[PDB]
Amino acid sequence: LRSVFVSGFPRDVDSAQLSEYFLAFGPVASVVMDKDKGVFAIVEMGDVGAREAVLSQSQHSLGGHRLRVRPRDSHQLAKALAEAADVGAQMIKLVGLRELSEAERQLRSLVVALMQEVFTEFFPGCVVHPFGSSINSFDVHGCDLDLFLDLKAEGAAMLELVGSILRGCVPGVYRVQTVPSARRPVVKFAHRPSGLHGDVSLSNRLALHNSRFLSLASELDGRVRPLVYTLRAWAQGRGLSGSGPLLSNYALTLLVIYFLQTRDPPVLPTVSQLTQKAGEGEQVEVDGWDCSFPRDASRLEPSINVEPLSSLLAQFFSAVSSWDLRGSLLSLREGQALPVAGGLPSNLWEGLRLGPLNLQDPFDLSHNVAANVTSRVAGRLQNCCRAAANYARSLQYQRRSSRGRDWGLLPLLQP
Ligand SMILES: [Mg+2]
Ligand SMILES: [Mg+2]
């Protein structure tokens, strides 16, 4: 597909002139005007890279006329987002569509209850804590159900025992696979009646609190869920968020939250500030790290930041693209970037893994959630952010479309 659809050039303009214009971007193979009609025309470039170079620039003009050059479940999403009022309404609608329905959530709680009632007989006093995607209120349709069982060879034996229990005892669950061989040992399971799948971890415990923190963030400000959902969909769109060297959903969420912490008025407070507001009985530590923070966001002061969702999204793209990733450790606790060269963040907090992208976990401070991210992924993240930022400054992002044209979020959510 080296050919591009080009329309909008003035009446009585030569195809040789279009050829001459597109000649700047590279070799032009052919230019064919619409024969019986007029208006648009098709331009085939010599190189596919030249075609990508033409599509790369959103600003085209000839003879004083601006040119439109375009290459030439999900459909429900696009249609619904096209029906919205503006960018903000689009983001909120995206949240409403992707988020779990109440039936799904209560179904999840029911399944958790089943698992608990089965496990309690084998391990008296054991507690099954749902964590991650389900309880952090960033949940999406068909997301994993991750359970933590609260009670390295003995760990493997115990893991196999849990696998056996899931296999032969609790009714309805199939696809049981024990995985001791991973950084965090886990037992994969699938419950058939509820149509759910997930992982059971022996000790993930710290992560549980992380989830809670995330939830609190969503309760602290109303823009958090739209921003995080939208940026999740976007990162998954550009191939940024993911499994391998790609960013994890948790790391991305942490990045968005950090961005919200770094705004001129803060949208979210720093984790340290939350720890200060914890209070008696809410004090909790895990592996030496302080995990404490308020139960409800009601007794916490609101955000004086008046920035709308659109401006916050554009500011996210711009700021993330503008940051220095390799030389900075992004801190959620202090809500700011701590310089790597000088300040030696690796001295205190021993075991901290630095690199292309450094993002510090709000509780365990020796943990870089972005440590897995390679140079290519980081650079491509900043590049995509620069792109999206330049797009957010256009009229296509800011305003709606009269009929049928993709506007606002829709170009950002496409592959
Ligand atoms: Mg019973
Ligand atoms: Mg999973």
Residue numbers in the entry: 55 to 126, 145 to 223, 334 to 597
Any passages from the paper?
After transcription, the 3′-end is oligo-uridylylated by a terminal uridylyltransferase, TUT1 (TUTase6)910, one of the members of the non-canonical nucleotidyltransferases. TUT1 is composed of N-terminal Zn-finger, RRM, palm, fingers and KA-1 domains.
The crystal of TUT1 lacking the N-terminal Zn-finger, PRR and C-terminal region (TUT1_ΔC) was also obtained (form-IV). The crystal belongs to the space group P43212. The structure was modelled and refined to an R factor of 20.3% (Rfree of 24.2%) up to 3.2 Å resolution. In the form-IV TUT1_ΔC structure, the N-terminal domain adopts a typical RRM fold, with four anti-parallel β-sheets stacked onto two α-helices. The linker region (residues 127–144), bridging the RRM and the fingers, was disordered and the electron density was not observed.
